[PDB]
Structure 1
Amino acid sequence: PARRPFIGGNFKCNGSLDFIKSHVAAIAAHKIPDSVDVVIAPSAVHLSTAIAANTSKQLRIAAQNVYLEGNGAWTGETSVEMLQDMGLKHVIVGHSERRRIMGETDEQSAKKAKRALEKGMTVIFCVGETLDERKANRTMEVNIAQLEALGKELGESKMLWKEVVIAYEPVWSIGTGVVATPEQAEEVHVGLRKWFAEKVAAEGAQHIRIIYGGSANGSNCEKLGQCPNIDGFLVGGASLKPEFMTMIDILTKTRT
């Protein structure tokens, strides 16, 4: 029931070539212990540049999205095969900006994840409810439906769950500066542990990482990290700034 802490930084649709070289170099220059997983996710056109600038043996690079077919006639998309050819092993799937703004459905998110996992990738799988859904008292029902879809696609092959990191990001917390309270986030995380224990495996539930995202930063992260079911963070805006490195330091001290 001892879990390795995880922190991811999602650059989103931001960055120039020079900023990527500079900021990746600054993170890579920081001490990153071997006892914590640290991942950053640049925009797709910047992945090659980030890889070249990454001089750290610990720092990993992730893609922000992937398509759910292999190589073929899919103009504008990126395949799992392309990422692995570049040497990448991490990918974000189902981010709310894609679920709620660009119409990506529960099942499509689940199918993207399944294919990446079967190929041997680590998937940061995102779930979260909107303000309306929370007001209608549907928080846990929404979050569990999103996960259930993945369970459906995965099947009785529960071994693929081993490379899933679940990221809970309430939609009303994304980019708004309104971070959830420790009480709000821990409640949802506890909910998800119990679902995982019931629907997948009790021993598995003890080992899978569940991270919190949505306005997480260097000021508010320490208190959150003390919640027992919060294994780390998926960081948006702050991952573009010097305080990402400070978050790495605090995560290490809190949970290792």
Structure 2
Amino acid sequence: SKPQPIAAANWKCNGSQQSLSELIDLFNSTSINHDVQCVVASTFVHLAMTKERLSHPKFVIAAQNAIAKSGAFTGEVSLPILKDFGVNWIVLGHSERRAYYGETNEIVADKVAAAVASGFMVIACIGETLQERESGRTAVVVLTQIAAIAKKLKKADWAKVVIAYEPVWAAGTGKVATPQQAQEAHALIRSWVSSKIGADVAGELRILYGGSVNGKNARTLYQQRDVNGFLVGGASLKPEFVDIIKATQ
């Protein structure tokens, strides 16, 4: 059987206290009858209200970024501060932070290693841009990204790691990933993990699809062998997210 699935909401830099409370109320009233870990990654500001008001036992809260240590880093939030706040999940290496906020493969890898060392479950993001895919460089780009992460982990650390594959090449470019394309990318990742880390690790690793997913297409995506759930963007701010959760049966 496939490993336990994950349905993660990446709210990105969005939400009002009122609009997000509506979503949390919906989640609290949702019947989830199978084993799936649901994750709500809100902005730092909204963690207080999500921690307080989420009552559904299958949900955990998550941060969308951090730096490794507390200190003289005005504007940033550290892993120790998040752990003290009760936050045990984190999304790291998102394509938007790789593109906009200076996160090289090695900076992402050090953040993931610090987060694992600090007791987080880590959703580590990798994926290639349209420039990189159109020039036939999916494999070099994606394997280089996960290899950089792997160099700062030991085998036992992968129990705390989740990989999200972002098809950045299909992000607002009008291009679209088929489920077969997503499976092929996930299969590439799992093959590397099996060979470099171990077949035992690869067998239980969650690889989440981080492309455009909605209530309509989620079930078809999840039926691919190497898809273990989702890191959802825009649909995670919509009632639609419930359908993405139930699609991981």
Q: Same fold (TM over 0.5)?
A: yes
Per-residue Cα deviation, 1:118-161 (whole angstroms, up to 9, x for no partner): 1111000000101111111000110111111111112xx21011
Counterpart CA distance in 1 for 2:6 and 2:196 is 24
Counterpart CA distance in 2 for 1:179 and 1:95 is 19
Counterpart CA distance in 1 for 2:136 and 2:172 is 23
**2:3 matched to 1:3?**
yes
Post-superposition offset of 1:179: 3.8
Is the CA contact 1:33–1:58 (under 8 Å) kept in the aligned structure 2?
Answer: no
Question: Residues 235 and 176 from structure 1, CA distance in 2 versus in 1: closer, same or farther, beyond 3 angstroms?
Answer: farther
Please tell me the residue identity of whatever aligns with 1:76: G
Alignment partner, residue 135 of structure 1: 134
Counterpart CA distance in 2 for 1:163 and 1:140 is 24
Counterpart CA distance in 2 for 1:174 and 1:25 is 29
Post-superposition offset of 1:32: 2.8
Instruction: Tell me how many residue pairs correspond in the alignment.
Output: 249
Is the CA contact 2:133–2:169 (under 8 Å) kept in the aligned structure 1?
Answer: no
Matches within 5 A, 1:51-90: 51-68=51-68, 70-90=69-89
Per-residue Cα deviation, 1:101-129 (whole angstroms, up to 9, x for no partner): 22211111001100110111100000010
Please tell me the residue identity of whatever aligns with 1:161: W
TM normalised by structure 2 equals 0.96
**2:70 matched to 1:49?**
no
Question: Residues 175 and 238 from structure 1, CA distance in 2 versus in 1: closer, same or farther, beyond 3 angstroms?
Answer: farther
**2:98 matched to 1:99?**
yes
Post-superposition offset of 1:174: 2.8
Post-superposition offset of 1:173: 2.4
Which piece of structure 1 moves more, 167-176 or 142-151? 167-176
Per-residue Cα deviation, 1:212-254 (whole angstroms, up to 9, x for no partner): 01211111111111110011111000000011011111212xx
Alignment partner, residue 202 of structure 1: 199
Counterpart CA distance in 2 for 1:78 and 1:189 is 31
Matched position secondary structure for 1:61: strand
Q: 2:158 aligns with which of 157, 161, 178?
A: 161
Matched position secondary structure for 1:251: coil
Matched position secondary structure for 2:4: coil
Matched position secondary structure for 1:238: helix
Alignment partner, residue 28 of structure 2: 28
Gaps of 5+ in 1: none
Matched position secondary structure for 1:206: helix
Identity percentage of aligned residues? 44
Please tell me the residue identity of whatever aligns with 1:215: S
Matched position secondary structure for 1:9: strand
**2:205 matched to 1:242?**
no
Matched position secondary structure for 2:214: coil
Alignment partner, residue 125 of structure 2: 126
Please tell me the residue identity of whatever aligns with 1:105: T
Counterpart CA distance in 2 for 1:174 and 1:142 is 17
Please tell me the residue identity of whatever aligns with 2:141: V
Alignment partner, residue 40 of structure 2: 40
Which piece of structure 1 moves more, 217-226 or 89-98? 217-226
Matches within 5 A, 1:173-212: 173-175=170-172, 178-212=175-209
TM normalised by structure 1 equals 0.93
Matched position secondary structure for 2:133: helix
Post-superposition offset of 1:172: 2.3
Is the CA contact 2:88–2:120 (under 8 Å) kept in the aligned structure 1?
Answer: yes
Is the CA contact 2:186–2:227 (under 8 Å) kept in the aligned structure 1?
Answer: yes
Q: Which runs of 4+ in 1 moved over 3 A?
A: 175-179
Post-superposition offset of 1:185: 0.9
Is the CA contact 2:131–2:169 (under 8 Å) kept in the aligned structure 1?
Answer: no
Which piece of structure 1 moves more, 88-97 or 28-37? 28-37
Counterpart CA distance in 2 for 1:2 and 1:239 is 23
